[PDB]
Write a protein that binds this ligand. Structure first.
Ligand SMILES: N[C@@H](Cc1cc(I)c(Oc2cc(I)c(O)c(I)c2)c(I)c1)C(=O)O
Ligand SMILES: N[C@@H](Cc1cc(I)c(Oc2cc(I)c(O)c(I)c2)c(I)c1)C(=O)O
Ligand SMILES: N[C@@H](Cc1cc(I)c(Oc2cc(I)c(O)c(I)c2)c(I)c1)C(=O)O
Ligand SMILES: N[C@@H](Cc1cc(I)c(Oc2cc(I)c(O)c(I)c2)c(I)c1)C(=O)O
Length: 568
């Protein structure tokens, strides 16, 4: 009779408190740390009263009613601001969801010895700081995976803080934020899929992906798994985080009890601890594909029953087409497989209302150009990457995309282009047959970042079109954009280049980011400059910066010499 009691008992007090803190920090990203912990503790102690008697006052209230009521107990609007706390459920929860900010304007690592002192001072307060700061900067983070990150975070300190601490803690902390931002972007795509294109689009994506990983499983087994996984991500993406974690744990138990009807690669994943086992299953490699599978053309092109099966049970028949095609093509990206199933459905739509056997007899010819376009694209960029290396590969992609959509803001163009260029590092080391799913599905994740970053403040009609027209065609849409000829050159400002004392002591990574910022501004100012012309200007300006960083009075040099180039 009490839902808060049910989840407190299923998850245990430690994971309960952590998940409630994550939930509050994702809904109110600007609220100070001390105010959230205070609300968390009141919630936890009420939950204990309900475990002791599920008929006590208020113990019958929904989780949304209880969490929303707490958040409503604690500046300038410029005339525009939604008032979520004046709404009733379920409208109030929808209002909270609509104010999640993907780009929180919030500040961006103290000394190694300084952290170690705060750790042993209070471990528990130190770990909650880690959850709070990540959750408020990534408001769609997959909440059960964040628990697994917090445990690896706790283990790095419980080892390195106790000969040298810097050479022990800093490499580990560095892979925790790489692997942290990869995980965040990956889940932002699932949530955008469910919220903008609907449940039916998500389930197709999951049929395709689970059929590749589990090609020996029966179609009925894949469909059960997809139904359970869709419920989990629906919950995590609508802020039902206690339910999401409880159902994720239940799904892992089901998979591990039924290994022999699912995959032979699960042996070791299923012997690991609670959070580690779900994380293991999520990244398991594909199983071996059965030999001598019958031809696809036999059931889907040649059978005289094609139009009958499409009419009598359309969702099952089209789901079977996708399952059968995907299990025998681990070498295709998920979005390519979804494009083929859409083409097949359109064709039967047309042909079954006409000699249909003759109408759709040549449907496989339509698939060949869909397969060839991404194969050639990724063959070319890998050639370029191997020649140029990551930094200059990034700069090649940055000039291309700035010229496609020059209205997009400079920070967003730099961040997206850097991430697009990481695809060569990540995927070009694989042999041919392994490259398409690695590269084209990573590119979907980065292009979705461009879409959600731009949606907050739309300025480019072309970005809006490609992001709203069709989820699976996003990458071909962007690849096809030419240079905008209607863009008026941006005029010089100069505030971009004002001296700051930190520019003469940059790390290598932050040097690249400064140079990439200046290249975007240059293309926006001179959209017709050739490649040789851009290089000559770039190389002269970098030499100016190196000159004045060696001066007796740095600021004087920057001010005196910078003005000459401005009036040149
Ligand atoms: N490269 C893709 C492939 C992939 C997607 C899903 I969707 C999936 O099914 C699960 C099951 C559980 I349990 C999870 O916690 C999650 I997250 C996904 C599995 I196996 C693999 C990816 O991993 O996204
Ligand atoms: N030297 C090549 C020209 C070429 C330039 C770029 I820059 C490039 O990289 C991308 C990456 C993405 I993602 C795109 O959507 C696009 I369009 C281009 C590729 I591949 C090829 C030739 O002449 O064959
Ligand atoms: N105004 C900013 C600091 C800032 C100063 C300069 I001078 C600059 O311009 C370049 C151009 C090239 I080409 C380089 O290789 C480098 I390093 C810096 C940039 I971008 C940023 C602030 O207040 O923080
Ligand atoms: N005297 C010109 C103004 C002008 C100043 C600069 I300094 C400049 O050089 C750069 C180099 C980089 I690198 C940039 O990102 C940018 I924006 C401009 C250029 I070309 C033109 C006029 O009044 O028309």
């Amino acid at each position: 009779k009490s839902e808060v009691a049910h989840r407190f008992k299923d998850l245990g007090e430690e994971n309960f408190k952590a998940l409630v803190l994550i939930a509050f920090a994702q809904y109110l990203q600007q609220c100070p740390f001390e105010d959230h912990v205070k609300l968390v503790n009141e919630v936890t102690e009420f939950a204990k009263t309900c475990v002791a008697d599920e008929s006590a006052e208020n113990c019958d209230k929904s989780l949304h009613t209880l969490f929303g009521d707490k958040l409503c107990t604690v500046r300038e609007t410029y005339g525009e601001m939604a008032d979520c706390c004046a709404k009733q459920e379920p409208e109030r929860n929808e209002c909270f969801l609509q104010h999640k900010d993907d780009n929180p304007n919030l500040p961006r690592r103290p000394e190694v010895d300084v952290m170690c002192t705060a750790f042993h001072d209070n471990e528990e307060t130190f770990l909650k700081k880690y959850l709070y700061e990540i959750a408020r900067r990534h408001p769609y983070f997959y909440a059960p995976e964040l628990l697994f990150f917090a445990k690896r975070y706790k283990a790095a300190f419980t080892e390195c803080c106790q000969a040298d601490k810097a050479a022990c803690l800093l490499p580990k902390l560095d892979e925790l934020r790489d692997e942290g931002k990869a995980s965040s972007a990956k889940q932002r795509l699932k949530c955008a899929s469910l919220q903008k294109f609907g449940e039916r689009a998500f389930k197709a994506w999951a049929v395709a992906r689970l059929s590749q990983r589990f090609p020996k499983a029966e179609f009925a087994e894949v469909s059960k798994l997809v139904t359970d996984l869709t419920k989990v991500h629906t919950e995590c993406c609508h802020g039902d985080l206690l339910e999401c974690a409880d159902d994720r744990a239940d799904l892992a138990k089901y998979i591990c009890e039924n290994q022999d009807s699912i995959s032979s690669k699960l042996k070791e994943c299923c012997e690991k601890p609670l959070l580690e086992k779900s994380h293991c299953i999520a990244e398991v490699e594909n199983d071996e594909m059965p030999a001598d599978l019958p031809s696809l053309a036999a059931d889907f092109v040649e059978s005289k029953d094609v139009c009958k099966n499409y009419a009598e049970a359309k969702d099952v028949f089209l789901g079977m087409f996708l399952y059968e095609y995907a299990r025998r093509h681990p070498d295709y990206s998920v979005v390519l497989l979804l494009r083929l199933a859409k083409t097949y459905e359109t064709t039967l739509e047309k042909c079954c209302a006409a000699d249909p056997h003759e109408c759709y007899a040549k449907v496989f010819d339509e698939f060949k150009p869909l397969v060839e376009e991404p194969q050639n694209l990724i063959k070319q960029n890998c050639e370029l990457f191997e020649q140029l290396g990551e930094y200059k590969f990034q700069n090649a992609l940055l000039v291309r995309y700035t010229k496609k959509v020059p209205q997009v803001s400079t920070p967003t163009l730099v961040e997206v282009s850097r991430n697009l260029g990481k695809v060569g590092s990540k995927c070009c080391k694989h042999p041919e047959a392994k490259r398409m799913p690695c590269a084209e599905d990573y590119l979907s994740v980065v292009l979705n970042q461009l879409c959600v970053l731009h949606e907050k403040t739309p300025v480019s009609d072309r970005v809006t079109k490609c992001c709203t027209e069709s989820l699976v065609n996003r990458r071909p849409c962007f690849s096809a954009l030419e240079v905008d000829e209607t863009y008026v050159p941006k005029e010089f400002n100069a505030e971009t280049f004002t001296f700051h004392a930190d520019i003469c002591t940059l790390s290598e990574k932050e040097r690249q980011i400064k140079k990439q910022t200046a290249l975007v501004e240059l293309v926006k100012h001179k959209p017709k400059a050739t490649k040789e012309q851009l290089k000559a200007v770039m190389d002269d300006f970098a030499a100016f910066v190196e000159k004045c960083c060696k001066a007796d009075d740095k600021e004087t040099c920057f001010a005196e010499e910078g003005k000459k180039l401005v009036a040149a």
